[PDB]
Write a protein that binds this ligand. Structure first.
Ligand SMILES: *CC(=O)CCC(=O)O
Ligand SMILES: *CC(=O)CCC(=O)O
Lengths: 146, 93, 93, 146
């Protein structure tokens, strides 16, 4: 055939892939975290948005740190051979490098490691997108008038 | 013959490192609101990094906090695109 | 009426967070070698994020370490693009 | 005039802007850092590359932590009104969030803060690019065969 360039990911596999949405709104008392009001609005918006992009959306609500790790582990163990990519959306409280389960923190690295090129072979060479709606600290941007 | 194990990852953070992330109880988070709006309008037209760039501008220009607490009043937010991708990404083909 | 003070910053890291960054005594660093090559070839043709994406692929695929020390042998590297930009950037006009 | 979109930065100012290159090769003994052989190759490559992009390149060699902070402070205090953007390239040893002067570390945040939208008004709304060639830790990527 003619000149072939590989500047863009192959996104014409039979399936676009999974879109795992973790929506944590209610947290355990001992954690000292408040309810994330309006988070359901985000979850629904994301479900519809990615549904229209042809992603197999799976919504999960109020998962403990244990359930988050177990979910990600199980998902990374699925056969993604016929999927073009992977998407994970995290909605919760957080700090730099951390996402909160309902009963405690989870290092983002622990979550993303399940999908490393050497640990999830059916996703090797495919785009793995992690969308994180959570604080990465307490600093506030005062902004500047333009 | 090999590629980095960290390659092909894209982290779309709602905010810059070390910063607070704003959410509206009625409309949802500034970032997710903006991300969905831009994906709905540009997913069949722009490469992903350019879509995310529009998200950065929308969040940065159209949102500002309002609080009875001066400490949290009139604050701004800039999302943070972290790309370890090795190719352009288009949701369409 | 305001924009974030952290807006319009772009951090082109040679490597991913927490990782080593490779340099060749004779040819220079893997990242800078690749960045200059891609800028020379695409600065008058591609938007900056797309140029940096080519840099990511070049570093990720064309380089691999060689060391007499097994600990540092056959290692790979993926650059890390961190964008807080609010618009597309073209070096030409 | 016709429809006006602002999807791209205005890069047609009289000047593209400055390209500050900090090339640290020789470090002080007490720091316990080795010479960064081949770094001059990078410095020269960058100087030529950005020269062809019409940037006003300024190369600096072996700067202490004090000189790095002073240089960045002085540069941020210049009038960048007629410049389209700003570029800073850092070549040195490093760790996560840190760049090393010849005699010690410098927090990257301290360097970039001089250019915040509220601290360098002549660069507000303009692209500020920081290119960092330095380690961000000690982890090594074993890679995966494709
Ligand atoms: C500050 C946080 O913990 C995250 C903000 C949120 O989306 O609830
Ligand atoms: C590991 C480091 O300190 C940076 C590598 C280099 O470019 O010298």
């Amino acid at each position: 055939s003619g000149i072939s360039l590989d500047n863009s990911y192959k996104m014409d596999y039979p399936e676009m892939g999974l879109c795992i949405i973790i929506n944590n709104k209610n947290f355990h008392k001992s954690t000292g975290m408040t309810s994330r009001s309006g988070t359901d609005v985000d979850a629904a918006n994301l479900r519809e948005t990615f549904r229209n992009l042809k992603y197999e959306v799976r919504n999960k609500n109020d998962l403990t740190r244990e359930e988050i790790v177990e979910l990600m582990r199980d998902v990374s163990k699925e056969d993604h051979s016929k999927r073009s990519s992977f998407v994970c959306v995290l909605l919760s409280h957080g700090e730099e490098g951390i996402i909160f389960g309902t009963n405690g923190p989870v290092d983002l690295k622990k979550i993303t490691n399940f999908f490393r090129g050497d640990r999830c072979r059916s996703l090797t060479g495919k785009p793995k997108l992690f969308i994180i709606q959570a604080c990465r600290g307490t600093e506030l941007d005062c902004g500047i008038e333009t | 013959h090999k590629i980095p194990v960290e390659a092909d990852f894209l982290y779309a953070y709602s905010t810059a490192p070390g910063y607070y992330s704003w959410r509206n109880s009625k409309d949802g988070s500034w970032f997710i609101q903006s991300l969905c709006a831009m994906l709905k309008q540009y997913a069949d037209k722009l490469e992903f990094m350019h879509i995310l760039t529009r998200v950065n501008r929308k969040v940065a220009t159209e949102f500002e906090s309002f609080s009875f607490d001066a400490t949290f009043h009139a604050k701004k937010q800039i999302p943070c695109i972290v790309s370890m991708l090795t190719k352009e990404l288009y949701f369409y083909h």
